[PDB]
Amino acid sequence: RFLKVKNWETDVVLTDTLHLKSTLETGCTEHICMGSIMLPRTKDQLFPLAKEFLDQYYSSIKRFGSKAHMDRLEEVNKEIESTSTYQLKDTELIYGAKHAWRNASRCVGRIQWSKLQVFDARDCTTAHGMFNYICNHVKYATNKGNLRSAITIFPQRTDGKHDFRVWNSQLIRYAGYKQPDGSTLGDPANVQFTEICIQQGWKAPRGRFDVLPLLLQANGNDPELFQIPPELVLEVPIRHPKFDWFKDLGLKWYGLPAVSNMLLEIGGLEFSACPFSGWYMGTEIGVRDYCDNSRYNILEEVAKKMDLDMRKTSSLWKDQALVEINIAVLYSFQSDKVTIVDHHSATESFIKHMENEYRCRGGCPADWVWIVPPMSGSITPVFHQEMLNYRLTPSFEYQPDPWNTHVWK
Amino acid sequence: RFLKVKNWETDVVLTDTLHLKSTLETGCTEHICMGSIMLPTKDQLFPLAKEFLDQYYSSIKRFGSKAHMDRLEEVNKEIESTSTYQLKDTELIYGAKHAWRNASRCVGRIQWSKLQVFDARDCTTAHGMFNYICNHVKYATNKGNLRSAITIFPQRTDGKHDFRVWNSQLIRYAGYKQPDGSTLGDPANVQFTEICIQQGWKAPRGRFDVLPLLLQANGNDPELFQIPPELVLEVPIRHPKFDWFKDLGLKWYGLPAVSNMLLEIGGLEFSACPFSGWYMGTEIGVRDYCDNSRYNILEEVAKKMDLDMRKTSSLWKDQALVEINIAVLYSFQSDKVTIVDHHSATESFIKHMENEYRCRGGCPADWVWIVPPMSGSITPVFHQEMLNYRLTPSFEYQPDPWNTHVW
Ligand code: HEM
Ligand code: HEM
Ligand SMILES: C[C@H](O)[C@H](O)[C@H]1CNc2nc(N)[nH]c(=O)c2N1
Ligand SMILES: C[C@H](O)[C@H](O)[C@H]1CNc2nc(N)[nH]c(=O)c2N1
Ligand SMILES: CCCNC(=[NH2+])NCCC[C@H](N)C(=O)O
Ligand SMILES: CCCNC(=[NH2+])NCCC[C@H](N)C(=O)O
Ligand SMILES: [Zn+2]
């Protein structure tokens, strides 16, 4: 079955066949679309998942059906029946990690998928060990501002009782503290985690931009706290090109975005601790982190300084202030020489990547709801692009926050 | 099953049961989501009619009454005899209002119950259609104080006597292909603008020429008509700060009025059912004015603002976008023509959603279409999870007539 996708701004039509290889469910039914919903083993099911993966791997290197291909399948089968699981070769791990990124339908930066530094941390055994691995990842990825995509992969899940987990949602993130008056100091998004850190012993400096400590869980044991070496945490003071009063807002952000709470599934194997990092698209900070009502919420303060007509929404003061803030984020990062991409460039690149993928791969799963930027949506090419969302493995998946499932010792 | 929807900004959770009454398909499957795709017999009729009549009588608190039963029997006998049936005026009004209520892509449904319905089922000719349409335009325009309305022409019979309004909207600007290879006016109407010429219209070759109505009655060939200029309310666009804006020479019409859709009620199909409301600022300022395939005016406006268009990261397109939309709203409001900004419209929709969920058990909504084309996340709907599904009565898309008409 072939599926057509049209770009209503260029009339360019593409054909998707890749979806024929999607195995997982999407959440939608022939009677209801849950496209905007944020989030809708056993010896038996493992080998098939292993085989599917290995066939994909060997096909990619043009060795499908080869003796090397058949021995690997036999080797893995034996291993699974013998140990109930199996270990991936280094090459398969790298291939797996890259494709999980390549298959992430909500990622607009996938044009960079083939360029990913994979750090094999499967020999790690303790939380201190995890900390060392993570520091090395942050330093390598940061590269003094010239950001490089990378991922660190800790030991896969076994009985589900010895999981490795990074309790932080991002390796680097600011603390949030709820005040008794109901207000919040810092980043609202991280209040609950900040509370856990404090409870675990963290001495919170209680400021507006406190880099959180790492809470690391190794081999199913209780998590431990670690402070990332300040010299390893690159930050950018936010100022505006024309508004000299902007800097006085006291804003800044970290340069390295590093998601650390997702699960990496490769050939049936589950890697519960797999922090990965890339670089920021300006709107993530400028629009969401700074202007979401439930985040820093700086629109008013910025608006006032600009002396905009805040009496009636129709003046579009919120929109005006929104643009200036995003100009400030991009300007500051560029001036400090810290990698970043604006939404115009990022979306234009995604379209080229997406078209390339259709011709070489026969498809490119994409989540329109997530691909389209949170500002100036229709002036970016993705808004006008029809997309097809479906799930391919390997892949990155969500998993419940560890504090909701961890059995304390 | 009972599905839940959460707003990630207020944490409010709503439970949806209304979806369990969905009938048509969505185009999606367990393996693939097509949420962003623009467009994914007597034995057949009575079931549909029954479904409709049941909801109608239920809405008037007479479910299972004799009147309910009698009506169901009358229609049943009418279908078996005439292979179709006619709706009572009350059922027609209820149907139209509910087709609007069920339009998952409409952000202004909080206004659903306030719809003036004009019964034009007694119409027989294109001239009659013109008369009905002018009356509709005049009533809805209300000198700038816009009022929602729909005019319903005769329902489809054998498919060979369908009434159709060939225009996509009652009021729209023409588009012509020039020698340069460029396009003059609105590129979106190039094809229609040609069929008008190919039919007789004498195009003024302007940047904003109000297109002539092309009306089709009883399957006959469409006829042209010029909407009395005095009935077409237009707004010149100026900025409340950049006095150079007026020089762009831009203007837009105040009455948005979709005319190419199909209204389906109790199985019956109304191929010509033009309806109107009022504009949300972004529709004109973001989409019609800035879309690359439309008037595509960003660069021009950018220049006059003298901003660095050298690098995309200066966000000149974004800065220029806001101002263009500030102007549209400013103009309309100055001329006292009804119009709503995306902030206000989305806030209303959220309220409507909450009302619908507690009174109806849900509200089908298409997130992709509900979220404005600019400043998406600073509007509440962005943070609102939505469930999309099809309910009848409904407004459906239909093939352009020029691709199906047998001259
Ligand atoms: C080169 C820099 C990259 C850019 C500019 C980029 C940009 C983005 C953005 C803007 C999002 C949506 C984020 C949000 O709204 O919170 C996203 C999501 C995602 N990206 Fe990328 N990305 C990059 C690199 C990567 C890398 C290296 C990986 C994996 C190895 C990756 C995996 C994903 C995944 C799995 C998601 C969805 C996660 C979720 O659902 O929250 N991205 N990316
Ligand atoms: C009172 C003011 C109203 C507002 C502000 C409003 C606004 C909107 C907007 C912004 C859209 C999407 C427009 C686009 O992007 O092309 C829309 C779509 C829609 N509206 Fe409303 N609407 C209003 C009244 C009405 C009325 C009176 C009806 C029906 C009688 C209605 C039926 C629909 C339908 C069926 C769609 C989807 C059409 C499509 O698929 O292209 N709307 N509305
Ligand atoms: C409810 C809705 O799904 C939610 O607000 C989504 C919309 N699109 C998004 N897109 C991106 N990139 N990131 C997000 O967090 C979201 N949130
Ligand atoms: C491809 C994509 O479906 C298309 O560009 C949609 C997106 N959302 C939209 N939303 C509204 N209101 N109107 C539109 O025309 C569109 N176009
Ligand atoms: C970790 C891979 C890079 N992905 C990315 N750019 N963004 C996703 C996480 C960043 C998050 N939106 C934030 O503002 O903090
Ligand atoms: C016809 C009812 C009102 N519907 C509405 N506001 N918009 C839909 C059609 C208008 C179209 N988006 C435009 O900019 O021209
Ligand atoms: Zn779907």
mmCIF file of N, CA, C and O in Angstrom, chain B residues 213-284:
data_model
loop_
_atom_site.group_PDB
_atom_site.id
_atom_site.type_symbol
_atom_site.label_atom_id
_atom_site.label_comp_id
_atom_site.label_asym_id
_atom_site.label_seq_id
_atom_site.Cartn_x
_atom_site.Cartn_y
_atom_site.Cartn_z
ATOM 1 N N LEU B 213 -20.012 35.952 -8.824
ATOM 2 C CA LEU B 213 -20.558 34.684 -8.379
ATOM 3 C C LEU B 213 -20.829 33.838 -9.614
ATOM 4 O O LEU B 213 -21.200 34.357 -10.667
ATOM 5 N N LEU B 214 -20.613 32.536 -9.486
ATOM 6 C CA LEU B 214 -20.854 31.598 -10.569
ATOM 7 C C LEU B 214 -21.822 30.612 -9.951
ATOM 8 O O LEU B 214 -21.414 29.674 -9.269
ATOM 9 N N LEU B 215 -23.107 30.825 -10.195
ATOM 10 C CA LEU B 215 -24.131 29.986 -9.601
ATOM 11 C C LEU B 215 -24.703 28.904 -10.496
ATOM 12 O O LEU B 215 -24.975 29.129 -11.672
ATOM 13 N N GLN B 216 -24.894 27.728 -9.907
ATOM 14 C CA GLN B 216 -25.426 26.566 -10.600
ATOM 15 C C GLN B 216 -26.703 26.085 -9.917
ATOM 16 O O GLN B 216 -26.691 25.752 -8.734
ATOM 17 N N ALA B 217 -27.799 26.045 -10.667
ATOM 18 C CA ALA B 217 -29.079 25.604 -10.128
ATOM 19 C C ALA B 217 -29.642 24.417 -10.906
ATOM 20 O O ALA B 217 -29.628 24.407 -12.135
ATOM 21 N N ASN B 218 -30.136 23.422 -10.176
ATOM 22 C CA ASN B 218 -30.724 22.224 -10.772
ATOM 23 C C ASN B 218 -29.839 21.493 -11.773
ATOM 24 O O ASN B 218 -30.344 20.812 -12.667
ATOM 25 N N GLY B 219 -28.527 21.630 -11.624
ATOM 26 C CA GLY B 219 -27.618 20.954 -12.528
ATOM 27 C C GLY B 219 -27.316 21.717 -13.801
ATOM 28 O O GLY B 219 -26.434 21.324 -14.566
ATOM 29 N N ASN B 220 -28.038 22.804 -14.042
ATOM 30 C CA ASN B 220 -27.809 23.594 -15.245
ATOM 31 C C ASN B 220 -26.405 24.188 -15.197
ATOM 32 O O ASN B 220 -25.708 24.061 -14.192
ATOM 33 N N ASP B 221 -25.986 24.826 -16.286
ATOM 34 C CA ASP B 221 -24.665 25.432 -16.332
ATOM 35 C C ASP B 221 -24.662 26.684 -15.468
ATOM 36 O O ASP B 221 -25.665 27.389 -15.376
ATOM 37 N N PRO B 222 -23.528 26.978 -14.821
ATOM 38 C CA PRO B 222 -23.412 28.152 -13.956
ATOM 39 C C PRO B 222 -23.551 29.481 -14.686
ATOM 40 O O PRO B 222 -23.159 29.611 -15.846
ATOM 41 N N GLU B 223 -24.110 30.466 -13.993
ATOM 42 C CA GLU B 223 -24.299 31.795 -14.552
ATOM 43 C C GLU B 223 -23.530 32.797 -13.707
ATOM 44 O O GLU B 223 -23.374 32.604 -12.501
ATOM 45 N N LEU B 224 -23.045 33.863 -14.333
ATOM 46 C CA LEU B 224 -22.306 34.878 -13.602
ATOM 47 C C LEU B 224 -23.235 35.966 -13.071
ATOM 48 O O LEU B 224 -24.320 36.184 -13.606
ATOM 49 N N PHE B 225 -22.792 36.631 -12.008
ATOM 50 C CA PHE B 225 -23.523 37.723 -11.372
ATOM 51 C C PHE B 225 -22.505 38.547 -10.598
ATOM 52 O O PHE B 225 -21.559 37.998 -10.039
ATOM 53 N N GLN B 226 -22.707 39.858 -10.551
ATOM 54 C CA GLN B 226 -21.804 40.736 -9.822
ATOM 55 C C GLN B 226 -22.471 41.151 -8.509
ATOM 56 O O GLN B 226 -23.550 41.748 -8.509
ATOM 57 N N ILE B 227 -21.843 40.816 -7.388
ATOM 58 C CA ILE B 227 -22.400 41.185 -6.097
ATOM 59 C C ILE B 227 -22.450 42.703 -6.028
ATOM 60 O O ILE B 227 -21.443 43.377 -6.245
ATOM 61 N N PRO B 228 -23.632 43.266 -5.735
ATOM 62 C CA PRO B 228 -23.718 44.723 -5.657
ATOM 63 C C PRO B 228 -22.554 45.256 -4.838
ATOM 64 O O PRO B 228 -22.431 44.966 -3.647
ATOM 65 N N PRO B 229 -21.667 46.032 -5.481
ATOM 66 C CA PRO B 229 -20.502 46.605 -4.808
ATOM 67 C C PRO B 229 -20.848 47.199 -3.452
ATOM 68 O O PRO B 229 -20.071 47.100 -2.502
ATOM 69 N N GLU B 230 -22.023 47.810 -3.364
ATOM 70 C CA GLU B 230 -22.441 48.420 -2.112
ATOM 71 C C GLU B 230 -22.682 47.375 -1.023
ATOM 72 O O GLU B 230 -22.803 47.711 0.153
ATOM 73 N N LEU B 231 -22.733 46.103 -1.408
ATOM 74 C CA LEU B 231 -22.945 45.040 -0.428
ATOM 75 C C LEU B 231 -21.631 44.423 0.061
ATOM 76 O O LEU B 231 -21.586 43.802 1.126
ATOM 77 N N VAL B 232 -20.564 44.612 -0.715
ATOM 78 C CA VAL B 232 -19.244 44.082 -0.373
ATOM 79 C C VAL B 232 -18.433 45.040 0.480
ATOM 80 O O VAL B 232 -17.788 45.949 -0.040
ATOM 81 N N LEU B 233 -18.455 44.823 1.790
ATOM 82 C CA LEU B 233 -17.713 45.657 2.722
ATOM 83 C C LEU B 233 -16.233 45.292 2.706
ATOM 84 O O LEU B 233 -15.867 44.141 2.939
ATOM 85 N N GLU B 234 -15.389 46.279 2.426
ATOM 86 C CA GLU B 234 -13.949 46.062 2.380
ATOM 87 C C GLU B 234 -13.256 46.991 3.359
ATOM 88 O O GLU B 234 -13.791 48.040 3.696
ATOM 89 N N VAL B 235 -12.067 46.599 3.809
ATOM 90 C CA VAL B 235 -11.295 47.391 4.765
ATOM 91 C C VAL B 235 -9.887 47.705 4.269
ATOM 92 O O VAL B 235 -9.105 46.795 3.978
ATOM 93 N N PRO B 236 -9.546 49.001 4.161
ATOM 94 C CA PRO B 236 -8.208 49.391 3.704
ATOM 95 C C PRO B 236 -7.275 49.130 4.878
ATOM 96 O O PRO B 236 -7.620 49.443 6.020
ATOM 97 N N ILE B 237 -6.105 48.559 4.613
ATOM 98 C CA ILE B 237 -5.186 48.233 5.700
ATOM 99 C C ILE B 237 -4.085 49.247 6.007
ATOM 100 O O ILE B 237 -3.224 49.531 5.169
ATOM 101 N N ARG B 238 -4.124 49.791 7.220
ATOM 102 C CA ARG B 238 -3.115 50.744 7.658
ATOM 103 C C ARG B 238 -2.582 50.350 9.033
ATOM 104 O O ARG B 238 -3.248 49.646 9.798
ATOM 105 N N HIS B 239 -1.374 50.807 9.333
ATOM 106 C CA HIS B 239 -0.722 50.502 10.597
ATOM 107 C C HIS B 239 -0.886 51.680 11.553
ATOM 108 O O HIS B 239 -0.838 52.832 11.127
ATOM 109 N N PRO B 240 -1.092 51.408 12.856
ATOM 110 C CA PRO B 240 -1.262 52.478 13.845
ATOM 111 C C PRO B 240 0.042 53.182 14.232
ATOM 112 O O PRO B 240 0.099 53.881 15.245
ATOM 113 N N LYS B 241 1.086 52.989 13.432
ATOM 114 C CA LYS B 241 2.376 53.624 13.693
ATOM 115 C C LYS B 241 3.179 53.857 12.420
ATOM 116 O O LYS B 241 3.801 54.904 12.259
ATOM 117 N N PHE B 242 3.163 52.888 11.513
ATOM 118 C CA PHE B 242 3.898 53.022 10.259
ATOM 119 C C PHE B 242 2.990 53.613 9.186
ATOM 120 O O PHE B 242 2.336 52.881 8.437
ATOM 121 N N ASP B 243 2.958 54.941 9.114
ATOM 122 C CA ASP B 243 2.131 55.622 8.129
ATOM 123 C C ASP B 243 2.517 55.261 6.707
ATOM 124 O O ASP B 243 1.842 55.658 5.766
ATOM 125 N N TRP B 244 3.602 54.517 6.536
ATOM 126 C CA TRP B 244 4.008 54.119 5.198
ATOM 127 C C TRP B 244 3.242 52.865 4.777
ATOM 128 O O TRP B 244 3.207 52.510 3.596
ATOM 129 N N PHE B 245 2.617 52.209 5.750
ATOM 130 C CA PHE B 245 1.873 50.982 5.487
ATOM 131 C C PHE B 245 0.782 51.163 4.435
ATOM 132 O O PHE B 245 0.639 50.340 3.525
ATOM 133 N N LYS B 246 0.016 52.242 4.557
ATOM 134 C CA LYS B 246 -1.056 52.517 3.608
ATOM 135 C C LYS B 246 -0.561 52.453 2.174
ATOM 136 O O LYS B 246 -1.324 52.133 1.267
ATOM 137 N N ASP B 247 0.718 52.756 1.972
ATOM 138 C CA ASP B 247 1.311 52.756 0.638
ATOM 139 C C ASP B 247 1.387 51.374 0.011
ATOM 140 O O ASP B 247 1.490 51.244 -1.214
ATOM 141 N N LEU B 248 1.344 50.341 0.848
ATOM 142 C CA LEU B 248 1.378 48.971 0.351
ATOM 143 C C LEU B 248 0.140 48.763 -0.511
ATOM 144 O O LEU B 248 0.108 47.895 -1.386
ATOM 145 N N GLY B 249 -0.877 49.583 -0.258
ATOM 146 C CA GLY B 249 -2.109 49.495 -1.018
ATOM 147 C C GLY B 249 -2.837 48.186 -0.794
ATOM 148 O O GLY B 249 -3.353 47.590 -1.736
ATOM 149 N N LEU B 250 -2.885 47.743 0.457
ATOM 150 C CA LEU B 250 -3.549 46.489 0.795
ATOM 151 C C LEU B 250 -4.933 46.728 1.401
ATOM 152 O O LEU B 250 -5.176 47.745 2.053
ATOM 153 N N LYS B 251 -5.827 45.772 1.173
ATOM 154 C CA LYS B 251 -7.184 45.821 1.703
ATOM 155 C C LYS B 251 -7.731 44.399 1.711
ATOM 156 O O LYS B 251 -7.219 43.532 1.002
ATOM 157 N N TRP B 252 -8.754 44.155 2.524
ATOM 158 C CA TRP B 252 -9.376 42.839 2.573
ATOM 159 C C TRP B 252 -10.871 42.998 2.845
ATOM 160 O O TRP B 252 -11.313 44.036 3.334
ATOM 161 N N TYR B 253 -11.647 41.976 2.508
ATOM 162 C CA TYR B 253 -13.091 42.014 2.719
ATOM 163 C C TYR B 253 -13.422 41.625 4.152
ATOM 164 O O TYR B 253 -12.704 40.837 4.767
ATOM 165 N N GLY B 254 -14.498 42.180 4.694
ATOM 166 C CA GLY B 254 -14.854 41.867 6.065
ATOM 167 C C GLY B 254 -15.655 40.589 6.280
ATOM 168 O O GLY B 254 -15.659 40.038 7.379
ATOM 169 N N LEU B 255 -16.315 40.099 5.241
ATOM 170 C CA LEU B 255 -17.146 38.911 5.398
ATOM 171 C C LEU B 255 -16.588 37.577 4.903
ATOM 172 O O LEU B 255 -16.570 37.303 3.701
ATOM 173 N N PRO B 256 -16.111 36.730 5.827
ATOM 174 C CA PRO B 256 -15.597 35.441 5.352
ATOM 175 C C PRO B 256 -16.851 34.589 5.142
ATOM 176 O O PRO B 256 -17.699 34.506 6.037
ATOM 177 N N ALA B 257 -16.992 33.983 3.967
ATOM 178 C CA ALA B 257 -18.186 33.187 3.692
ATOM 179 C C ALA B 257 -17.906 31.984 2.794
ATOM 180 O O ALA B 257 -17.947 32.096 1.565
ATOM 181 N N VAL B 258 -17.635 30.840 3.424
ATOM 182 C CA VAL B 258 -17.326 29.589 2.732
ATOM 183 C C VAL B 258 -18.528 29.066 1.968
ATOM 184 O O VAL B 258 -19.592 28.853 2.542
ATOM 185 N N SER B 259 -18.358 28.832 0.672
ATOM 186 C CA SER B 259 -19.478 28.385 -0.150
ATOM 187 C C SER B 259 -19.333 27.088 -0.936
ATOM 188 O O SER B 259 -20.273 26.688 -1.624
ATOM 189 N N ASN B 260 -18.189 26.422 -0.836
ATOM 190 C CA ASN B 260 -17.978 25.184 -1.586
ATOM 191 C C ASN B 260 -18.172 23.889 -0.801
ATOM 192 O O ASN B 260 -17.922 22.800 -1.322
ATOM 193 N N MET B 261 -18.644 23.983 0.435
ATOM 194 C CA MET B 261 -18.815 22.775 1.224
ATOM 195 C C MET B 261 -20.178 22.118 1.099
ATOM 196 O O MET B 261 -21.116 22.701 0.553
ATOM 197 N N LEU B 262 -20.268 20.891 1.602
ATOM 198 C CA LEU B 262 -21.508 20.119 1.570
ATOM 199 C C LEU B 262 -22.047 19.871 2.975
ATOM 200 O O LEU B 262 -21.337 19.352 3.847
ATOM 201 N N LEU B 263 -23.301 20.256 3.190
ATOM 202 C CA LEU B 263 -23.963 20.074 4.478
ATOM 203 C C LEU B 263 -24.766 18.784 4.453
ATOM 204 O O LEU B 263 -25.660 18.614 3.628
ATOM 205 N N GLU B 264 -24.445 17.878 5.366
ATOM 206 C CA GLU B 264 -25.136 16.598 5.449
ATOM 207 C C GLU B 264 -25.974 16.538 6.731
ATOM 208 O O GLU B 264 -25.447 16.697 7.833
ATOM 209 N N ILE B 265 -27.281 16.334 6.579
ATOM 210 C CA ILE B 265 -28.187 16.236 7.718
ATOM 211 C C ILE B 265 -29.094 15.026 7.497
ATOM 212 O O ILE B 265 -29.688 14.877 6.426
ATOM 213 N N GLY B 266 -29.199 14.170 8.511
ATOM 214 C CA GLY B 266 -30.039 12.986 8.404
ATOM 215 C C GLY B 266 -29.924 12.258 7.074
ATOM 216 O O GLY B 266 -30.930 11.822 6.509
ATOM 217 N N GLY B 267 -28.702 12.128 6.569
ATOM 218 C CA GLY B 267 -28.494 11.439 5.307
ATOM 219 C C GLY B 267 -28.662 12.302 4.068
ATOM 220 O O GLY B 267 -28.137 11.973 2.997
ATOM 221 N N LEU B 268 -29.395 13.403 4.203
ATOM 222 C CA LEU B 268 -29.625 14.302 3.079
ATOM 223 C C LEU B 268 -28.395 15.170 2.836
ATOM 224 O O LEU B 268 -27.677 15.523 3.773
ATOM 225 N N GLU B 269 -28.157 15.514 1.574
ATOM 226 C CA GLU B 269 -26.992 16.305 1.197
ATOM 227 C C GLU B 269 -27.336 17.636 0.540
ATOM 228 O O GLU B 269 -28.071 17.696 -0.446
ATOM 229 N N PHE B 270 -26.785 18.709 1.085
ATOM 230 C CA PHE B 270 -27.025 20.029 0.539
ATOM 231 C C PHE B 270 -25.711 20.500 -0.059
ATOM 232 O O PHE B 270 -24.818 20.955 0.655
ATOM 233 N N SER B 271 -25.604 20.357 -1.378
ATOM 234 C CA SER B 271 -24.405 20.715 -2.126
ATOM 235 C C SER B 271 -24.115 22.211 -2.237
ATOM 236 O O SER B 271 -23.000 22.606 -2.582
ATOM 237 N N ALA B 272 -25.116 23.042 -1.963
ATOM 238 C CA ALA B 272 -24.945 24.492 -2.007
ATOM 239 C C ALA B 272 -25.497 24.994 -0.677
ATOM 240 O O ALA B 272 -26.712 25.049 -0.474
ATOM 241 N N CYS B 273 -24.593 25.361 0.222
ATOM 242 C CA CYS B 273 -24.974 25.807 1.555
ATOM 243 C C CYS B 273 -24.000 26.846 2.073
ATOM 244 O O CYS B 273 -23.401 26.666 3.127
ATOM 245 N N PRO B 274 -23.848 27.962 1.355
ATOM 246 C CA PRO B 274 -22.916 28.988 1.812
ATOM 247 C C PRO B 274 -23.216 29.474 3.236
ATOM 248 O O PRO B 274 -24.374 29.680 3.600
ATOM 249 N N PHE B 275 -22.165 29.636 4.036
ATOM 250 C CA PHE B 275 -22.305 30.114 5.407
ATOM 251 C C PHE B 275 -21.234 31.163 5.703
ATOM 252 O O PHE B 275 -20.194 31.195 5.045
ATOM 253 N N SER B 276 -21.491 32.028 6.684
ATOM 254 C CA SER B 276 -20.539 33.068 7.035
ATOM 255 C C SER B 276 -20.502 33.375 8.528
ATOM 256 O O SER B 276 -21.432 33.056 9.268
ATOM 257 N N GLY B 277 -19.404 33.997 8.949
ATOM 258 C CA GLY B 277 -19.216 34.389 10.334
ATOM 259 C C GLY B 277 -18.384 35.654 10.281
ATOM 260 O O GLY B 277 -18.792 36.653 9.692
ATOM 261 N N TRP B 278 -17.219 35.617 10.907
ATOM 262 C CA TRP B 278 -16.307 36.751 10.874
ATOM 263 C C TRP B 278 -14.895 36.210 10.992
ATOM 264 O O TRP B 278 -14.687 35.049 11.366
ATOM 265 N N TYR B 279 -13.936 37.059 10.665
ATOM 266 C CA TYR B 279 -12.527 36.689 10.661
ATOM 267 C C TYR B 279 -11.787 36.669 11.978
ATOM 268 O O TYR B 279 -12.148 37.362 12.926
ATOM 269 N N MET B 280 -10.739 35.849 12.017
ATOM 270 C CA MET B 280 -9.837 35.814 13.157
ATOM 271 C C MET B 280 -8.678 36.515 12.456
ATOM 272 O O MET B 280 -8.355 36.176 11.319
ATOM 273 N N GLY B 281 -8.083 37.505 13.114
ATOM 274 C CA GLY B 281 -7.006 38.274 12.507
ATOM 275 C C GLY B 281 -5.963 37.536 11.692
ATOM 276 O O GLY B 281 -5.699 37.898 10.545
ATOM 277 N N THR B 282 -5.368 36.504 12.279
ATOM 278 C CA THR B 282 -4.324 35.727 11.616
ATOM 279 C C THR B 282 -4.673 35.148 10.250
ATOM 280 O O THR B 282 -3.776 34.936 9.429
ATOM 281 N N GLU B 283 -5.950 34.870 10.002
ATOM 282 C CA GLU B 283 -6.349 34.300 8.724
ATOM 283 C C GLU B 283 -5.910 35.175 7.556
ATOM 284 O O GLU B 283 -5.460 34.676 6.520
ATOM 285 N N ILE B 284 -6.059 36.481 7.727
ATOM 286 C CA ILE B 284 -5.703 37.431 6.683
ATOM 287 C C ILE B 284 -4.246 37.860 6.788
ATOM 288 O O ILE B 284 -3.489 37.764 5.820
#
